[PDB]
């Protein structure tokens, strides 16, 4: 009995607490949980960017965050349970019970990490690191593994924090082909630390429509602070879903081999600020954008870039309303550690992301286009100023990663 083909009655959730939410050719439910996840994405992204200086890059995987906190929700109760449901917009899947969310989440994960005879690799790993001394709830243990594949590995936080820390770090690294390293700095993890919950997500894809390295050239890129810098600009001409939306902003979709996952770029006209577009980027607008796209012939100028980012999510989430989970006095996670211990709370939550974009990904290729003549009045998309980037799974309308490229220069 595996969850990917299962019906809800085949998977008894038996959650300690339950919250009742108020008020195409894909699964209706996993599509709603998708709408939920994206709602969290743009709102969270809006906050994150507003707390950021305009000349800084931003990269993160909102799906990773939602998954990690959904894993945590499994043992949440009362108001900790409600805030989680509201903050992550799971409560917006009308009348559905908080327990149902996890079934849906598992269904969404099954599709996403298909592992079929595909061309792009999208992998995910989750895991629980509990102190060997503690005794975890049998149900929490079971469900975390059934719904999220998260296994529970015993570690010695009490005596060997440093050794435990290296074990975890080694694990994330391995599950991210080495792109996410020392997630846990030598400082954190002590003795008071009883549980380290972790989600990883890894993606690698090749362009369906090639950017020949031979065409890449240094070009000026215009930062928000009015100055310039030298970027490696990739170039090609060909058909791409595109659309010039409000106030001259250009939305472009670059698919990966398999067409299942794409890269979406949002480039405001030179006159307008990305901050202004960030502020107006509503979940419904973004969906509207994405749905109005149409195949077209254009010239593409896109820098090659590598972005590495990391930050604590605590403060951001608190502003959005996730307060109890972080308060040792208000936090209610009675479902996690078996036998009392009511005062378990999240001390901190960290996100670390990596993004590399270029030709061929990982030089040795070229492209020859013979006998082509395009309209001298073709649409051009020149990303030499700040723009937003998204990496999405189209059939599932899932935002896997998002960010902002304020500075691609070295």
């Amino acid at each position: 009995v595996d969850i990917c083909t299962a019906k809800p009655r085949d998977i008894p959730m038996n959650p300690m607490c339950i919250y009742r939410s108020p008020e195409e050719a894909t699964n209706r439910r996993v599509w709603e949980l998708s709408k939920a996840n994206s709602r969290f994405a743009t709102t969270f992204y809006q906050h994150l960017a507003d707390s950021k200086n305009d000349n800084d890059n931003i990269f993160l995987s909102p799906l990773s965050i939602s998954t990690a906190f959904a894993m945590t929700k499994l043992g949440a109760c009362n108001d900790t349970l409600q805030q989680l449901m509201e903050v992550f917009k799971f409560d917006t899947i009308s009348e559905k019970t908080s327990d149902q969310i996890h079934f849906f989440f598992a269904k969404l994960n099954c599709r996403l990490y298909r592992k079929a005879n595909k061309s792009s690799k999208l992998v995910s790993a989750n895991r629980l690191f509990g102190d060997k001394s503690l005794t975890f709830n049998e149900t929490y243990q079971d469900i975390s593994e059934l719904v999220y594949g998260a296994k529970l590995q015993p570690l010695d936080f009490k005596e060997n924090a440093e050794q435990s820390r290296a074990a975890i770090n080694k694990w994330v690294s391995n599950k991210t082909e080495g792109r996410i390293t020392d997630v846990i700095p030598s400082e954190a993890i002590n003795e008071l630390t009883v549980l380290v919950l972790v989600n990883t997500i890894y993606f690698k894809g090749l362009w369906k429509s090639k950017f020949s390295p031979e065409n890449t050239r240094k070009e000026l890129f215009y930062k928000a602070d009015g100055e310039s810098c030298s970027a490696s600009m990739m170039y090609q001409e060909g058909k791409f879903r595109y659309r010039r939306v409000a106030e001259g902003t250009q939305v472009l979709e670059l698919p990966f081999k398999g067409d299942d996952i794409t890269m979406v770029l949002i480039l405001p006209k030179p006159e307008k600020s990305l901050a202004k577009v960030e502020k107006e980027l509503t979940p419904e607008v973004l969906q509207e954008w994405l749905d109005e796209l149409e195949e077209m012939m254009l010239v593409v100028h896109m820098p090659r870039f590598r972005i590495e980012d990391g930050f604590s999510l605590k403060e951001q989430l608190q502003d959005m309303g996730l307060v109890d989970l972080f308060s040792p006095e208000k936090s209610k996670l009675p479902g996690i550690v078996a036998e009392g211990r009511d005062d378990l709370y999240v001390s901190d939550a960290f996100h670390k992301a990596f993004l590399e974009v270029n030709e061929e990904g990982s030089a040795s290729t070229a492209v020859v286009i013979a006998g082509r003549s395009l309209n001298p009045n073709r649409v051009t998309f020149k990303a030499n100023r700040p723009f937003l980037v998204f990496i999405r799974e189209v059939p599932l309308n899932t935002i896997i990663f998002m960010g902002r490229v304020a500075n691609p220069c070295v």
């Binding site: 990690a68 630390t193 380290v196 919950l197 972790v198 996690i336 001390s347």
Partner: peptide, 4 residues
Amino acid sequence: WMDF
């Protein structure tokens, strides 16, 4: 990572 999340630290409980």
